């Protein structure tokens with residue numbers, strides 16, 4: 090299965106990529122919202138892990154845009170942790186929302202859980 094990881098911080102991106110690889114997933118990466126949409130269209134990932142504070146296009150806009158055409162599972166992963174952030178994320182179409190700092194194992198488990206549907 091193929092995961093698109095969207096995050097503008099390379100160290101965070103790398104950590105997630107390392108862990109999903111070790112899990113057997115094919116990983117594709119994007120470092121801003123424009124790249125996220127471009128990779129989504131080119132790669133057709135099975136699941137997107139989606140940072141919110143991004144250059145070019147923010148994660149909410151990315152999610153809103155993707156949802157015009159696709160029901161691909163989206164897991165938002167953000168330092169933004171307020172009630173408002175989580176609720177708007179989910180209402181815009183995120184299937185799950187995980188906050189930074191995060192557990193690698195819990196991220197793994199939630200990806201498996203989302204894929205399971």
Ligand code: BEF
Nearest residue numbers: 140141142167168
């Ligand atoms: F910049 Be992500 F919203 F932690």
Ligand SMILES: [Mn+2]
Nearest residue numbers: 097140142143
């Ligand atoms: Mn960010």
